[PDB]
Antibody
Framework: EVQLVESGGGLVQPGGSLRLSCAAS????????IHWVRQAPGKGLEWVAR????????RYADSVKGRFTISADTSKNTAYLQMNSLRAEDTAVYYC?????????????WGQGTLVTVS | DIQMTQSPSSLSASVGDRVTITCRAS??????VAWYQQKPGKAPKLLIY???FLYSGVPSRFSGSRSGTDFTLTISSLQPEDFATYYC?????????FGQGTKVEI
């Protein structure tokens, strides 16, 4: 069955770095896009970034652009969000998701979420 | 770029009530609007894609509708487990943008 599992969340100092992983099962991430979405207290859901793992093409929201990068290891079937220069506002639950049927099914599979706390 | 305006921000209702949430896009998005349910402690879950298609598995009391740039989610008979925050999203162009969310309390 199709699943995404995130890991890497935890407590990190302001200005520090963290890497989140998003491991896929039951489909190949290089057949789709992987998105990251975060839920900061009081700010609903915010789209953060996406990657097309075939060629590593990326897009970033203005809020994280220039600080966060996405990568993917297609052999491990895993995407990564590399977070740099972390600030208070980056405190959130981070989700990964796939763009099912290259967007026809919107975000049809979601990870369980991992909390990042900038302290 | 595309702003999604969701209303209301929160509402309260009883088990068995019909509730409707509205989403307005700042530009044409064709049919491409999704609705997600997020229960406290849980990941968002897709309910509706392309304004009115029910994601396979999702209870049929959830339905989506579209009138031009106006989109609605209806829950026809609220169940205890439907207490959640609901979000609309356009999946027309990048970046995918979300409504502010509507918190539904029982």
């Amino acid at each position: 069955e199709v699943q995404l599992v995130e890991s890497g969340g935890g407590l990190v100092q302001p200005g520090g770095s963290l890497r989140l992983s998003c491991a896929a099962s039951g489909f190949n991430i290089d057949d789709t896009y992987i998105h990251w979405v975060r839920q900061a207290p009081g700010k609903g859901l915010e789209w953060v970034a996406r990657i097309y793992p075939t060629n590593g093409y990326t897009r970033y929201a203005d809020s994280v652009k220039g600080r966060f990068t996405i990568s993917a290891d297609t052999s491990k079937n895993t995407a990564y969000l590399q977070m740099n220069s972390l600030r208070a506002e980056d405190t959130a639950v981070y989700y990964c998701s796939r763009w099912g049927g290259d967007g026809f099914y919107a975000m049809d599979v979601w990870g369980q979420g991992t909390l990042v706390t900038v302290s | 770029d595309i702003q999604m305006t969701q209303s209301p921000s929160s509402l309260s209702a009883s088990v068995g009530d019909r509730v409707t949430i509205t989403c307005r896009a700042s530009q044409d998005v064709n049919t491409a609007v999704a609705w997600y349910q997020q229960k406290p402690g849980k990941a968002p879950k897709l309910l509706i894609y392309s304004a009115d298609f029910l994601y396979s598995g999702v209870p049929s009391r959830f339905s989506g509708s579209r009138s031009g740039t106006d989109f609605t989610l209806t829950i026809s008979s609220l169940q205890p487990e439907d207490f959640a925050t609901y979000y609309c999203q356009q999946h027309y162009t990048t970046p995918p943008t979300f409504g502010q969310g509507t918190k539904v309390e029982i």
